[PDB]
Design a protein around this ligand. Structure first.
Ligand code: MG
Length: 494
């Protein structure tokens, strides 16, 4: 492929365009038609020295993109993204893509230095408002300046890729597409790109079975936490002392834990993700797997931001407690969250911090509601949605730079929290708690990569969770909350 960060981002490509083929009825017909479309483009090619051409075949039936991905062999990078259903919540912003899977890379974007405005421009060079489905999928580290552990090395400070071949699932139809990207200046010619794509295209499977089998066929040989329970309790106690004493200004810090599971045979990360998705309720599913890397997968309820043209929306959370099996106990916990003066204060500092980040960029900011409880599968928490209108679509970068990370994964004051996290946690978060999603021409969306796992061949998996530590947090309750938060992974691996 080619690293678009190496490109001359101040010079536009020769073309960015999408060509749509005649619709077919089946995935097998789409695969054969796309092979022919690539061959036709090779025979009558664009003559620019750089460009992106997306070829897409509509499929007249609804097919799960995760089912397509499971049928593909290990052509990397592997990407998956499925946005939240957003059931019942209002759209503050006032053909919807249900899920997308990708294999290979038409162009990728990676550096060891933190994602910068120039890197964003490098990606924007390959996108266009008139090609709304040309999208770069990937994510960024929680802390791009932290020491990168071996398991996270392939991801760099950030990793994004436009797939070589992708499958799009819509409401009542689907699409198979291939993207040809090239830049002679980066020594990745149109000829190079078509040759690589034709080789991948002949490998693409159309045997898109609807996978429903819940057995993952692996045995867990051990489970160990970092920090251990014995080290976690003094860590939380250290944060509580900083909060309540007057030497430190700390008010909130998110402390995380890496739960390592060793398995006898390799976990299939796509099959695992598919199990979470079938149960996922109002959540983002994702997979990011650079070449030769472990697969970063997750099923997260939390949005960093969504942009549709000039509208951006985000959200705020704080004050988490369990769900309860009994309806009366569940309601009592929720009422305690909604009425507690202390929880109200702790939620407000998160909500108002995110609000003012948006307010510095957007003319108007709307908050709705000021405070509710969002009920997740195993926990519930105070919640608010926030939205604003940009003055121009190019302010997308400012939104991303302002929001990541929020106090929902870092803390307040941000710098005192960031250094406590550096000091207390012995493991690399990598892209856990970092933005994960996609850039597109007129639309971009990023989840927060919590509720996630790094799935490594010949090892097992690293499963991540964290909680917000504030005045009065109870270490035993917080530890239990970490267990609740990873249980979608630990229950399904059995
Ligand atoms: Mg908490």
């Amino acid at each position: 492929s080619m690293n678009g960060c190496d490109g001359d981002f101040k010079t536009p490509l020769g073309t960015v365009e999408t060509r749509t083929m005649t619709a077919v009825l089946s995935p097998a017909a789409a695969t054969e038609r796309l092979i022919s479309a690539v061959s036709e483009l090779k025979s009558q090619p664009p003559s620019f020295s750089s460009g992106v051409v997306r070829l897409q075949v509509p499929i007249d039936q609804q097919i799960g993109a995760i089912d397509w991905l499971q049928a593909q062999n290990e052509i990397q990078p592997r990407c998956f993204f499925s946005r939240r259903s957003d059931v019942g919540r209002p759209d503050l912003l006032l053909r919807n893509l249900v899920s997308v899977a990708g294999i290979g890379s038409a162009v990728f974007f990676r550096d060891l230095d933190p994602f910068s405005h120039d890197d964003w421009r490098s990606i924007r060079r390959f996108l266009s408002s008139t090609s709304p489905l040309i999208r770069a999928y990937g994510g960024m580290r929680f802390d791009p300046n932290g020491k990168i552990a071996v398991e996270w090395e392939p991801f760099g400070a950030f990793y994004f890729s436009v797939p070589q071949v992708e499958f799009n699932e819509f409401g009542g139809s689907s699409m198979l597409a291939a993207t040809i990207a090239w830049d002679d200046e980066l020594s990745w010619t149109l000829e190079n790109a078509i040759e690589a794509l034709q080789e991948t295209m002949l490998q693409v499977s159309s045997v898109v079975m609807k996978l429903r089998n819940r057995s993952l066929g692996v045995s867990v040989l051990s489970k160990n936490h970092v920090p251990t329970k014995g080290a976690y309790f003094p860590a939380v106690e250290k944060a509580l002392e900083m909060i309540n004493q007057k030497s430190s200004p700390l008010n909130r810090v998110v402390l995380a834990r890496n739960s390592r599971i060793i398995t006898d045979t390799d976990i299939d990360p796509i099959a695992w993700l598919a199990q979470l998705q079938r149960e996922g309720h109002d959540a983002y599913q994702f997979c990011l797997q650079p070449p030769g890397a472990p697969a970063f997968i997750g099923n997260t309820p939390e949005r960093l931001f969504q942009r549709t043209q000039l509208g951006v929306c985000s959200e705020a959370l704080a004050a988490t407690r369990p769900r309860a099996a009994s309806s009366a106990r569940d309601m009592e916990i929720e009422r305690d969250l909604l009425t507690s003066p202390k929880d109200d204060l702790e939620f407000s500092i998160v909500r108002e911090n995110i609000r003012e980040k948006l307010n510095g960029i957007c003319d108007r900011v709307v908050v709705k509601p000021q405070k509710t409880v969002r009920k997740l599968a195993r926990v519930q928490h105070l919640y608010s949605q926030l939205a604003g209108r940009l003055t121009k679509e190019d302010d997308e970068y400012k939104i991303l730079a302002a929001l990541h990370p929020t106090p929902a994964v870092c803390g307040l004051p941000a710098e005192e929290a960031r250094l406590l996290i550096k000091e207390i946690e012995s493991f690399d978060r990598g892209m856990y708690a970092g933005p994960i999603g996609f850039f597109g021409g007129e639309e971009s969306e990023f989840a927060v990569g919590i509720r996630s796992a790094l799935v490594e061949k010949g090892l097992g998996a690293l499963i991540y969770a964290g909680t917000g530590i504030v005045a009065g947090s109870d270490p035993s309750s917080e530890w239990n909350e970490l267990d609740l938060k990873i249980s979608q992974f630990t229950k399904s691996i059995e």
